Amino acid sequence: NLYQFKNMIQCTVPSRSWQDFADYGCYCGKGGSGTPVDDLDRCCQVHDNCYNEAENISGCRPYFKTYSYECTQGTLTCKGDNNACAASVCDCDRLAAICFAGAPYNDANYNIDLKARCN
Ligand SMILES: [Ca+2]
């Protein structure tokens, strides 16, 4: 769920407030369309597409599904007790969190005008 994803981000990118990734580019946060503006945005595009794919699973609601995971000593792990939905969503979140840690963060790309720039 989003609370868990927030925690994944806190654990792979502790140097930033989680909310720095909640409204960035065309894909990080509410936005889900247009040109990814940079590599961080591309991380979010993949994440968004990953969620859309997980939503094909019956009863699978990525913002809400509580999965089983651990973040310890620099590593994120999706646990074995996860059902197909939980495993898929956890993997989406894990890969995105790792992606965020390796992407440059451009302040100019925070809170962009989605209606104008993400068609
Ligand atoms: Ca999004």
- Ligand 1: distance of its center to the CA of 104 in Å? 18
Q: How was this structure determined?
A: X-ray
Considering only CA atoms, which of 84, 35, 79 is closest in space to residue 57?
Answer: 84
Please confirm, yes or no, whether 93 is among the known catalytic residues: yes
* Distance from the alpha carbon of residue 72 to the mean position of ligand 1, in angstroms: 26
- DSSP 3-state of 71: strand
**Mutual angle of helices 84-102 and 39-54, in 10-degree steps:** 180
Question: Domains in the chain, ordered, with CATH?
Answer: 1-119 (1.20.90.10)
Q: Which of 20, 47, 81, 91 is catalytic?
A: 47
Residue 71 burial (C-beta neighbours within 10 Å; 0-12, 13-18, 19+): middle
Q: How far is the CA of 25 from the centre of ligand 1 (A)?
A: 9
User: Do 9 and 18 form a contact (C-beta atoms < 8 A)?
Assistant: yes
| Region for 25 from its dihedrals, namely left if φ exceeds 0, alpha if ψ lies in -120 to 50, beta otherwise | left
Contact (CB, 8 A) for 4 and 78: no
Active site residue 38: no
Q: What is the dihedral of CA 17, 23, 24, 28, to 10 degrees?
A: 100
- Minimal CA–CA distance to 44: which of 55, 33, 53, 54? 33
Smallest CA-to-CA distance from 32 within 19, 23, 45 is with 45
